[PDB]
Structures are given as structure tokens and as C-alpha cells.
Amino acid sequence: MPYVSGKTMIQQAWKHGYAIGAFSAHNAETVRAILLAAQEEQSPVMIQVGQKVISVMGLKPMKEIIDAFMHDITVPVCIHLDHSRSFEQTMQAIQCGFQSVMFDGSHLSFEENVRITRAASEVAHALNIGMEGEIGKIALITSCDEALRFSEGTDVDYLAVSIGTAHPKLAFGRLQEIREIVKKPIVLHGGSGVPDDQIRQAIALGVAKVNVDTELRQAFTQGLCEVLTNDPEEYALAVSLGHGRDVMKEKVIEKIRLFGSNGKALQF
Amino acid sequence: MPYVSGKTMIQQAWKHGYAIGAFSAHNAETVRAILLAAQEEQSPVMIQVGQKVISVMGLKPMKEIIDAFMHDITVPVCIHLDHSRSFEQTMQAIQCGFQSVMFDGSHLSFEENVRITRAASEVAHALNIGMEGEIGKIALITSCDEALRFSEGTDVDYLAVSIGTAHPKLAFGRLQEIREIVKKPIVLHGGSGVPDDQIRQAIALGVAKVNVDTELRQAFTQGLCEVLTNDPEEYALAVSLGHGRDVMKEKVIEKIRLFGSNGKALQF
Amino acid sequence: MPYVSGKTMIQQAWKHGYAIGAFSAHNAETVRAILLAAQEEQSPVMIQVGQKVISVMGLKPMKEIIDAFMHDITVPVCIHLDHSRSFEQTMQAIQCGFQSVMFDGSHLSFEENVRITRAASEVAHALNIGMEGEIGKIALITSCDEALRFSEGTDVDYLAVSIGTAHPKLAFGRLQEIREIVKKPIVLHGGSGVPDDQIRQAIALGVAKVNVDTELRQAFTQGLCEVLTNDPEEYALAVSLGHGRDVMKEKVIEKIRLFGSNGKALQF
Amino acid sequence: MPYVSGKTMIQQAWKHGYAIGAFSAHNAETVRAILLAAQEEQSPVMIQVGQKVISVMGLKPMKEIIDAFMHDITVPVCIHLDHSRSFEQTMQAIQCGFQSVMFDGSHLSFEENVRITRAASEVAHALNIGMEGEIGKIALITSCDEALRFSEGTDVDYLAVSIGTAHPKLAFGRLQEIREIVKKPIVLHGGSGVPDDQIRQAIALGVAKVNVDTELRQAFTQGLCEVLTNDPEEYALAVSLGHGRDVMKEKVIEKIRLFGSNGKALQF
Ligand SMILES: [Zn+2]
Ligand SMILES: [Zn+2]
Ligand SMILES: [Zn+2]
Ligand SMILES: [Zn+2]
Ligand SMILES: [Zn+2]
Ligand SMILES: [Zn+2]
Ligand SMILES: [Zn+2]
Ligand SMILES: [Zn+2]
């Protein structure tokens, strides 16, 4: 489609000093809210399929729902598997044509995280798919050495580290050091619990992908409640879930602007 | 898939004295609620794509969302275009592989209703797709003569007439007369405003397709409100929209049982 | 894909004084020969699926084989159903996403040709698909009056008439008169039995689609024989059928140049 | 589709004392010849996409051509990647939905053959895809020890060894020893240069997949020559390539019967 590899998309954002919003989708309205936001803002975007939606809707059905809503979309879109803890699941996402995957081995030993992430990375790189991995430790902030050893052992395109969020004060100095030593884009997890000003500075220092989930569901739910609070007998899902969608679309737009990706679709 | 022609499905229900529920879907959760209901009840089912959802989600995207959720479904499923007033729209549904279409020309003159419905019917019949049409009048209840003239001029497989509902007391005698003279299955519109006992008798007299929309959206919305009434800070769409889905699934099950299609999937 | 409506493609050729070659395909190598020819020449092209290949390979399988070979093709391509004599078959081609269809009712009465062609034309026009029809008579050359009456009654986009070929001296004056009175592009059938100079003049006078079948199969067969004449123990289909493909590709290139469509892909 | 995993298909043949023919396809007619042969014989079958056809037609286009001809096929079919020497190519076959792959590392050191084959095997096994590997040596016949070490290090489902053919007298004793020690199905390569009686005995001793390529192309070419020898002006590809197809279909039938898979589709 106008689907683009996550490797290409993130590296471009990192090179040009902005980030890609990685927006978690959970159903039809939420997928559409993200895509319409991106199209209006002329922004590249990632749509994340994470573990919660996979347990509810299925991985391959969500992929197919995204495909269904791409009919009128011309901006760069990358479908990303979020926080996989299974080599098998990661392979399923690769097989149904995702453009980016994350194997999160941060719960494993350093050696095993590296070994499985690396094995997934070799498959992704064979098929032009972006690869994300994550490390915590090998005091609670990842060291340059740990980040470099992880990056080199796995060949991930982009990496998440322990930088001061939780799944909050960002370790800006550390992030700066990581850009110079590791020389790869950084992914922020748990960024919704951090102020906007801090987000902007993290991106200036090398964060090129920012995960957004709860904040979108909060905006969606707030739209729903507002309609149904006013009128509990409003039975048109077009109106109730529709307003949720509009309020979530506005949130996505707000994030796109924060991240600096508005207007960047021309660059691809 | 286990997709089946609407002509086959409705004629079978009519022959065997039960009806097919034609359940209007509006998004991912609502499609899934219908399919899971049908699978659990071992019931043939129609999923309707009507004018409201087409204005919100699009016709072809809804078709593709239904396809996405068929992965584990083995019961007979027929996707039906509801209340089209456009020859063009009806042709679009045929092109993307619907198994039943309705052209509603009941707002047109008798001659023009017949002419357009007939033209759509010739396309549907060329491709093994079920065809529905509707007549009101040519006192507020359709005459046998009108129903026969419409049926013969259009060659519809199943037809809706003015039988005592509104889009309420059913014209049972008239329906009986229509079975003997017209000798085709009847479709009920506006049946949610009619008691269960009346529905059961209409089916005994030849109603073989019963449209259900508002009652499902009411059940969905009631699930949503219940979760969000309890806890407005419940931001998991899996929980809020999920409970809506479960409450809607139960409604579909209730309708399947009313219509008598539970257990009938073996018959196909 | 870079699939384009036949209505668009033919009208453009007619407006600009060139024709589209409508090249009949019969299998994998022959489809590819046409597409590679068109890509090299930067030419719009029609690929025809006609009655012979439908009896051998099937209509929907040929469509899917064309789709398989479009992966690296960027020039305008239109898949056309050739010489259908069945409303049902024409509807099947529409359903699987052809971009042009021909219903040939020239074996029927004038009134019935018009009635069926018109019915197919209404479906095609509903879905942005090009429509071709054919008339002979209502002395062996079609009159302006007959062509105009047929064109007006059917609303075909392009039409074949009896102009001096057989399925040979072209009726150039008649063709000129037809351009001024009917004001639609003309399709030539049986053009392989006519010299190049005559083809060029027919195109100058309004022929905008030229059917090519036998000449391609002759070129293919000549490639095959040449390899197998030299070496009957050449068992590599890559070599034998491959050389057939190369010799057929050259023939297609030759036709593209005759028709004047080389270089015209920029115009779309 | 009625596509079945190669792991399932080969293990079943091995368990029941017959083999699966793995028939190399090169284009539309040759795919169809194999499928029609299998359907008529009520036989499970593998269709191989090997290195020659990949260089001519492409890997993904051949997959899509096979899919196009499955419309009326109900017997078990497995699409297999033959003699890949590239991890990347093997991953491409996995991604487009092959049901069996072979990584041939027999040109590499033992350690590197094992390492790459194993890595491909982990991906295949994650997605329920059959895995083949090959070993020669670590005098020209593979030892039990070598076969066991290779089998254990890679976890292939089925394996090719050096058993007395060339890419000829079969090493029956060795094959017997391999069944008892390795306890996996064996794949024969280069079996066309071996008599039928020898093939039957190899299958009795554990050969459960027999590759067939040249013999089919020889049968196809012989059909072609026969038509074109008689009549060089026979330009109907339906007749010339058609007769090739019929003569190749008969060859496939002959192989199915040799291998003992005729009638075995019921067993699945
Ligand atoms: Zn995270
Ligand atoms: Zn994380
Ligand atoms: Zn209605
Ligand atoms: Zn109605
Ligand atoms: Zn012709
Ligand atoms: Zn003709
Ligand atoms: Zn081999
Ligand atoms: Zn080999």
C-alpha cells in the first residue's frame, strides 16, 4: 500500500530531528481515528498492534482491519507489533506483512534477550521489516555500555532502554550519551506519564519513536461518556462511538504536532 | 469462505419453517458479536451492511472487516446489503462479493421500482447472489395482487411488504394469503416494535428473514453504560466495548432462538 | 494496481490520435510478454481475456495470473473481456475486477443486441468499467445510421462495426463518417489480415483499440519451433517457452509502435 | 485452501509406507497438469517452486499462479520451496505462505549448514511449515552418524542425504539403517535417473518425498514437439501447449502410482 518499512520511517525521523508517533489501535474506530489524523496532518505514522488487542481481536484480524481503512490514505503508514514476548507471535506478524516488529526480551537474561532478539532481527532484516528490542539492566537507568552491547549483539534498528519512565524524570544526559555511542534511534515507552516539554527534549536528543496507547483510550472513552452522559438513549454507534473517534482523532493530532511529524509526508 | 448465497439460505429457512436473523453490524465488536452468537448456537445467519454503517465506515471496508472475523467460523454466513436506494451501490456490493442484496425501490413508482429492482435482480441471479425487494402500495397493507405483480415483475428471491410494522399489529391473514399466492419467502422490516409471540406466528406463516438493528445497538449501548456508569475511568476498550459486545451477543442469541435457526447449521 | 478504466484509456488514445493495442493472453509467458513489452515501450496497454483462454484456463484464474505479473509494472494496464456472448460471463468479469468488458450481441437481432448490451453497459458504467459492443448490419459495411442507432441505444464507450475486415479492404470513408456522426472511438477486429499502412490510417480516422491475438500466437509458436527444431532434447521450458516469449514480446513491441502508444504512459 | 503443512503430509506418507511426489512447476500449464493429476488420482501432492522457475517467473508470482488453479481442487496440496541456498529467499517463501521449505546448505561446512538450516527450521516450525535440509558428507554415501548429527542439530522434519543418486545405485542398506537411527522421513533427489523397482524399494525403507522435475519437462516437451512436428502452423496454444499439458499430466499420474499416493487423500 503506502505502507513503508519501519526501518526507513524511524531512521528518517531520527535523521531529521522529529519522532514517529506509534499509536496503539484496538478496533475499527480507533484505527480510523489514527489514519485520518495522519492524513489530515500530512504525517508519517505507526499503528501499533499490541498484546491487549491481540488477546481481544487477534493479530491477523487487526492487520486486516488496518488494510481495510487504507483505501483513501496516501501518507506513509507502518504497522508495528508492540511488546511481543513470543518468537512465534513475532514470526506471525512478519508472515502477515507487518512493516515493523518488537521482540521484548527485557524479562530474560542479557544473553537470552540478545539471542532471541537477534534471531527475530535476522528474519525482519531478510524481509525489509523494522526491528525494535528493549533492555533494562545487565542505577535503574540503562548504561551506555549495556545499550551498546545490546544494540551490537542484536542488530535492532531502534531500541528502547530504561531512561526514566515506567510502563518519571527523563535521563537526558544518558540519552545524549546513547546517541553518540550507540548511534541508533531510541524508542520511548511510558511517555504519557511525562510532560510535553520533556518529550520535545527527548526527541531533540534522539528519541525517534514515541509509543501512545492509554492517552488515546482515555480520549476515546471521554468522547463516549460525554455523549452517553448527555443522552443514555443515544443508540446510534455512529454518534456515540463516532464522537469517541473524533475526540481520539484530536488527541492523535495533538501528539503528531508534539512529535514534530506534521508535514513530513512530502519527505518520503 | 463458509459464505452461502442468500437465495439458498432464505429458501431453506422458508422450506423448514424457521427464519434467518439479519443482524445489522456497525463495527468490529458488533460483527464479532453476531458471528460468535451464530457459531455458539450452530445457526445460519445474515450480517447486514446498511445505509448508516456505509456512511460511517464504507461498504467495502465493512465487507473486509466481516472477512477478517470469519477465520474461526464454520456456520453458514451471508453478507447482505440492506435498504440500498442506489443501483450503483447495489452493484458495488455485488462486485465486492456480497451474498445477498436489497434494492429498495418502495419510494418509486410501481413501474420504476419494478424496472430497477428487476435490473439488479438479473445481475444478482447471474452471480448466485440472493435478491430482496420491497413494495408498499400500488388500505396501508399490501394486497396479494400488488405483492404478486411486484414479485413476478422483479424475480426477487424474497420480498418485504407492508404487513403492519413501521420503519404495530401484523396482518397475519394477509401474510397467509401471500404465502399461497406469491409462493416466496417474506422479509420482515421493523420487527423490533413487535412482540415475540407475533414474530413466531409470522415465521410460521412464511416470514423467513427478520431484520434486527436497533435492538442490538440498544443492547450494545447498555453494556457500555453499565461499565462506564460503574467506573468512568475504565479506559480498557476490551472491558467497556467488550461488555457491550457480550451484552449484544446475548441479544443475538435470544433472536436466533426466537427465529428458530439454532441448530440448523447441520442442515447445510 | 496501475490498472486503469478502459473508458479512460481508450478515450485518451482517441483524443490524442493513437490506439491502444488489445493483446490477447493465453498463459503465464504470454501475459508477461505483453506487460514487459508495454513497460519497455512506456505504453498504455490492454490485455484481453477471450473465449478460447476462458475455455482452457478459466476467466478468474487468468485475471489472477495477470495480477501476479503486475508486481513491477508501472504503465497503465486495462484487463478486457473479449467477445463475450453471455450476460452471465460479462457479469463474472465485472465481479472479479476487469477494467473493460465487451458483450458481443452481433449474432442477435438489433433490438436484442441493444437490450443486452445496454443492460451490461449500465452495470459497467456503475463501476467505472469500459464497455465495448459490436454491430454488423440492421452492403456488408455498417451504415452511419446503424452505428448511431446502436451507439445511442447501448451507451457503449467504444464500438466495433463491420468496416471491411473479417473475423480485407478497410472502409476508410465510412470510418470517417462514423467519427463525425457517432463521436465515439472505434475498435478494430480482424486487423491482423490488414497491412500496416491501412492500420495507421484507420487510427488517424478514429480507431482507438486494435485487437491482436493470432499474430502473437504465431510469433510465440515460431520462437518455440526454432528452439525445438534446433534441439528437440532442450527440456528447459525457460529456454523453449522463454524464446517464444521473447519473440512474442518483440511482436507486441512492433504493434505498440504501429499503434502509436509508445511513450504515452506519461500522459496518464 | 486445502493447503496442508508439509510436516503433516510427509510424516503421514512415511507412517503409512508411501511417498509424496514433489512435482516441479514452471508455468500455468505445468501447475495445472500436476493439480489435475492429483485430483483425478485422489492423491496428496507437493508442488515445488525451485530455483530455475524463480529466476524466470519469480517466487511470489508462482505462488499466486498455484493459488489461481486451486479453485476446484479438494485433495491435499503443499507448496514447497526447492533447493534454496539463501536464508533470505527461504524467508520470502515463508512470508508468502508456502507450506514447506528446503534450505540446502550442503555446499557449506557442517557447522554452517547446521547453523543456517536450524535458523530457518525455527521460523518454519513457528508457523507450522515443513522443513527440509540436505547433507552429503562431514565413502560418497552419507553415514548414519553424519545423518543423525545433522538431523539433531537442525530439527528438520525431512532430510535428503547422499544415498547413491546424483543431481546411480541406491544404498538400500544405509537407508534402512537411517530409518532406525534417525527416525525421520527421507527425501530423494535425482530419482529420475533410477529405475522404478529401486524407487519402490526406497519408499518401503523410508523415502517419503520424491522430487520430480526433468521427467515432467521431458513429457511436456514431447507433447509440444508431437503437435508441432505434425503441424508447424498449429497456432492454438490450447492445442500445442495443451497436448504438452496432457502428456505431462499422464507422467504425473504415472509417478503418483509409482509412489503409492493414489487414493490416499481420504486419509487426510
Ligand atoms: Zn511499552
Ligand atoms: Zn517496553
Ligand atoms: Zn428495513
Ligand atoms: Zn423496508
Ligand atoms: Zn474480434
Ligand atoms: Zn467482433
Ligand atoms: Zn534436488
Ligand atoms: Zn539436493
The 3-class SS string of chain A reads: CCECCHHHHHHHHHHHCCCEEEEECCCHHHHHHHHHHHHHHCCCEEEEECHHHHHHCCHHHHHHHHHHCCCCCCCCEEEEEEEECCHHHHHHHHHCCCCEEEECCCCCCHHHHHHHHHHHHHHHHHCCCEEEEECCCCCCCCCHHHHHHHHHHHCCCEEECCCCCCCCCCCHHHHHHHHHHHCCCEEECCHHHCCHHHHHHHHHCCEEEEEECHHHHHHHHHHHHHHHHHCCCCCCHHHHHHHHHHHHHHHHHHHHHHHCCCCHHHHC
CATH number where C78 lies: 3.20.20.70
Q: Where are the beta strands (DSSP E) in chain A?
A: 20-24, 45-49, 77-84, 100-103, 130-134, 158-160, 186-188, 207-212
| D214: DSSP letter | H
- Residue C52 and residue D242: Cβ atoms within 8 Å? no
Start-to-end CA span in chain C (Å): 14
> What are the grid coordinates assigned to B18, written together?
424457521
**Residue A25 φ/ψ region, left for φ over 0, alpha for ψ in the -120 to 50 degree band, beta for the rest:** beta
Q: Is residue A1 part of a domain?
A: no
Among A88, A97, A123, the residue with its CB nearest the CB of D91 is A123
Q: Do the beta carbons of residue D131 and residue D100 sit within 8 Å?
A: yes
Nearest alpha carbon to residue D27 among D216, D255, D256: D216
Q: List the catalytic residues of D.
A: 82
In 10 A of CB A30, how many CB atoms?
27
- Residue D61 and residue C55: Cβ atoms within 8 Å? no
CA B63 – ligand 3 centroid, Å? 19
What's the sign of the alpha-carbon dihedral A256, A258, A260, A262?
A: positive
d(CA D143, CA D178): 8
> What are the grid coordinates assigned to C176, written together?
470517417
Q: How far is CA D79 from the centre of its chain?
A: 9
Q: Do the beta carbons of residue D28 and residue D123 sit within 8 Å?
A: no
Look-up: residue for cell 504503465? C75
B211 three-class SS: strand
In 10 A of CB C130, how many CB atoms?
27
d(CA D255, CA D260): 8
Q: Do chains D and B touch (3 or more CB pairs under 8 A)?
A: no
Q: Is residue C1 part of a domain?
A: no
Find, in chain A, the residue whose alpha carbon is nearest to that of B217: A235
Which residues 157-186 of B are in CB contact (within 8 Å) with A? none
d(CA D233, CA C218): 8
Tell me the DSSP string of C240-263.
Answer: HHHHHHHHHHHHHHHHHHHHT-TT
Q: Which residues form the domain of C249?
A: 6-267
Among B71, B225, B235, the residue with its CB nearest the CB of A221 is B235
Q: Is D127 on the interface with A (CB under 8 A)?
A: yes
d(CA B91, CA C94): 10
Helix (H) or strand (E) holding B93: helix B87-95
Helix (H) or strand (E) holding D82: strand D77-84
d(CA B74, CA C151): 49
Nearest alpha carbon to residue D27 among C47, C33, C222: C33
Q: Count the helices and strands in chain A (H runs, E runs).
A: 11, 8
Find, in chain A, the residue whose alpha carbon is nearest to that of B239: A56
> What are the grid coordinates assigned to B177, written together?
394469503
Q: Is residue A54 part of a domain?
A: yes
Q: How far is CA D131 from the centre of its chain?
A: 12
A102 three-class SS: strand
Strands D77-84 and D45-49: parallel
Radius of gyration of chain B measured on its C-alpha atoms: 18
Start-to-end CA span in chain A (Å): 14
Q: Is A109 on the interface with B (CB under 8 A)?
A: no
Q: Where are the beta strands (DSSP E) in D114-205?
A: 130-134, 158-160, 186-188
B54 three-class SS: helix
Cited resolution, angstroms: 1.7
A72 three-class SS: coil
Find all residues with CB under 8 Å of B99, minimum gap 6, and list them: B3, B4, B5, B6, B9, B78, B79, B80, B129, B130
d(CA A199, CA A207): 9
Q: Is residue B255 part of a domain?
A: yes
Look-up: residue for cell 492509554? A214
Residue A79: what residue type?
I
Q: How far is CA C141 from the centre of its chain?
A: 21
Tell me the DSSP string of A229-264.
Answer: HH-TT---HHHHHHHHHHHHHHHHHHHHHHHT-TTG
The domain total for chain A is 1
The Cα-based distances of B135 to B61, B99, B149 in angstroms read: 30, 22, 10
The CA-based angle D85-A101-A50, given to 5 degrees, is: 145
Find, in chain A, the residue whose alpha carbon is nearest to that of D94: A95
Nearest alpha carbon to residue C126 among B174, D91, B101, D184: B101
Find all residues with CB under 8 Å of C31, minimum gap 6, and list them: C25, C47, C62, C65, C66, C69
Find all residues with CB under 8 Å of C111, minimum gap 6, and list them: none
> What are the grid coordinates assigned to D254, written together?
504415472
In 10 A of CB D7, how many CB atoms?
21
> What are the grid coordinates assigned to A238, written together?
455512529
d(CA D98, CA C92): 29
- Residue D122 and residue A122: Cβ atoms within 8 Å? no
Return the half-sphere exposure (C-beta side, CA atoms, 13 A cut-off) of residue A121.
Answer: 23
**Range D183-186 contact pairs with CB under 8 angstroms and sequence separation of 24 or more:** D184/D14, D184/D151, D184/D156, D184/D157, D184/D158, D184/D159, D185/D10, D185/D11, D185/D13, D185/D14, D185/D157, D185/D158, D185/D159, D185/D209, D186/D158, D186/D159, D186/D160, D186/D161
Catalytic residue among B67, B72, B82, B145: B82
| D168: DSSP letter | -
d(CA B182, CA B112): 20
d(CA D28, CA C28): 6
d(CA B104, CA B109): 12
Among A95, A119, A126, the residue with its CB nearest the CB of D127 is A95
d(CA A30, CA C263): 44
Chains in touch with B (≥3 Cβ pairs < 8 A): A, C
d(CA C98, CA C81): 7
Look-up: residue for cell 442506489? B86
Q: Do the beta carbons of residue D267 and residue D12 sit within 8 Å?
A: yes
Q: Do the beta carbons of residue C159 and residue C184 sit within 8 Å?
A: yes
Q: Is residue D1 part of a domain?
A: no
Q: Do the beta carbons of residue D5 and residue D129 sit within 8 Å?
A: yes
How many residues are there in chain D? 268
CA dihedral B66, B71, B73, B74 (to 10 degrees): 120
Start-to-end CA span in chain D (Å): 14
Which residues of B fall within a CB distance of 8 Å from A58?
71
C99 three-class SS: coil
Residue B174: what residue type?
R
β partners of residue D210: D21, D188
d(CA C245, CA D36): 25
| C142: DSSP letter | P
β partners of residue D186: D159, D207
> What are the grid coordinates assigned to A88, written together?
512465534
> What are the grid coordinates assigned to C129, written together?
468499467
d(CA B61, CA B147): 35
d(CA D41, CA A73): 48
Nearest alpha carbon to residue B264 among B4, B9, B79, B7: B9
Nearest alpha carbon to residue A48 among A213, A174, A244, A236: A213
Q: Do the beta carbons of residue A29 and residue B53 sit within 8 Å?
A: no
Number of Cβ pairs < 8 A linking chain B and chain C: 29
| B3: DSSP letter | B
Residue B48: what residue type?
Q
d(CA C38, CA D51): 27
Q: Is residue B1 part of a domain?
A: no
- Name the maximum alpha-carbon separation found in chain B: 59
Look-up: residue for cell 538400500? D172
Breaks (C-N over 2.5 A) in chain C follow: 138, 167
Q: Is B127 on the interface with C (CB under 8 A)?
A: yes
Nearest alpha carbon to residue C69 among D57, A27, A213, D258: D57
d(CA A242, CA B41): 31
The CA-based angle A76-A77-A83, given to 5 degrees, is: 140
Q: Do the beta carbons of residue D105 and residue D113 sit within 8 Å?
A: yes
CA D104 – ligand 8 centroid, Å? 7
Which residues of A fall within a CB distance of 8 Å from D119?
119, 122
Q: Do the beta carbons of residue A27 and residue A245 sit within 8 Å?
A: no
The Cα-based distances of C263 to B138, C14, C23, C202, D202 in angstroms read: 59, 15, 18, 20, 59
Nearest alpha carbon to residue A36 among B174, D65, D105, B61: B61
The CA-based angle A91-A97-A98, given to 5 degrees, is: 80
d(CA C67, CA C2): 11
- Burial label for D142, CB within 10 Å (0-12, 13-18, 19+), is buried
Q: Is residue A151 part of a domain?
A: yes
Q: Do the beta carbons of residue B177 and residue B144 sit within 8 Å?
A: yes
Q: How far is CA A192 from the centre of its chain?
A: 12
Q: Do the beta carbons of residue D73 and residue D38 sit within 8 Å?
A: yes
